[model samples]
Target: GSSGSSGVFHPVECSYCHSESMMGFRYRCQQCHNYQLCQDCFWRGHAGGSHSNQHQMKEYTSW
Candidate 1:
């Protein structure tokens, strides 16, 4: 008999954090390229690296 490993996920941390994605779904990205941010990063980075409503943004979820 053989056994395979399974994967699991619970909390969705930030790209720079071992924490939560700030409470809920707030991730988005472009099609051609994968660009996304968390609730904290998206808004804060929004001021700095945020897309600013230019590229195609799509809301996605992670668990």
Candidate 2:
């Protein structure tokens, strides 16, 4: 049995805005540790708390 597991996907919330999102667009911080940001938050420039705009961010895409 597969233990009723629907793959190994986990929910990731926006570190800046603290919003629950899983679609549209997602971003992950490369310099920061485990920092994720949604499209809306990232576009509005939510890099303030221990994060800077110069930090490298990679696009988070789900399968």
Candidate 3:
């Protein structure tokens, strides 16, 4: 669930795990600017690339 420093596989993916995620629990960091992460990383407060889980993030959902 942790890999890749920079790269976007699908149209959208998590920042920490860097996996494609066009589903629910998609998190977009507010302070990170263009930073996005899945629920696992987001919930655990993944602290990578100076990104903190304490930072506010908005979720986007789609089927």
Candidate 4:
């Protein structure tokens, strides 16, 4: 269980996909506020990721 006042997250797809591809880290923001665009979804959504720079951006782009 979690606190109700905390901000919620609903992931449609995987985030930090691209990063996961190169770095091997399954980072998703499902039900969490850390919506990181993983490496797999790099070319899929272009959710601010494609290359290393973009991948790095997913490090801490949460609210």
Candidate 5:
């Protein structure tokens, strides 16, 4: 969902909590299929429904 403006950059929403804040970090699930979670959601143990808590995840500053 991108517009024609190149000057604007929209942060991707977290798959778990849908947060777009720049303060928190973004986490991507390595075990699941293209799954992403924010800092709050990830550390709080809020996985999508059937996802495992021990699944590997990658961290990024921005989405």
Candidate 6:
């Protein structure tokens, strides 16, 4: 989760070509601090391919 970078859009994805496959958009969760992306998006990386290195999901959970 990178602040506003990972907005609130349950499950994440562009919402347009999402159904085509479970892999459409890339979204990282700030609360859980995890990089979540569909198969297709995972390859694209985070921040719409902005972050130099691919975003990695932080490992840690309260629950």
Best by TM-score: 5
**Residues 1-63 of candidate 2: C-alpha lDDT, one tens digit per residue:** 133358644455455575654553567878886667777776676666688877766786752
In candidate 3, stretches whose alpha carbon ends up further than 4 angstroms from where it belongs are: 1-12, 20-24
CA lDDT, every model vs. true structure: 0.51, 0.65, 0.64, 0.39, 0.69, 0.42
- Taking the tens digit of each residue's C-alpha lDDT, what string does model 4 give over 19-44? 31234334443333445555455435
1 or 4, which is superior by lDDT?
1
The model with the greatest lDDT is 5
The 10 consecutive residues of candidate 5 with the worst lDDT sum are 1-10
Enumerate residue pairs that collide in model 3: none
Q: Write the per-residue lDDT of candidate 5 for residues 1-63, one digit (tens) a residue.
A: 335666646666666577756656778778777677777876677554667887867887666
Candidate 1 least-lDDT 10 residues: 1-10
Off by over 4 Å in 4: 1-32, 46-56, 59-63
Model 2 segments more than 4 A misplaced: 1-13, 20-23
Ranking by TM-score: 5, 2, 3, 1, 6, 4
lDDT of 3 by residue, 1-63 (tens): 565658753455555576554553677778775676677776567665577656888876631
lDDT of 1: 0.51
Residue ranges of candidate 6 with Cα displaced over 4 Å: 1-19, 22-35, 48-54, 57-63
TM-score for each predicted model, relative to the true structure: 0.43, 0.54, 0.51, 0.22, 0.62, 0.28
* Candidate 1 residue-wise lDDT at 32: 39
Q: Each prediction's Cα RMSD?
A: 7.5, 6.1, 6.6, 10.7, 3.7, 10.2
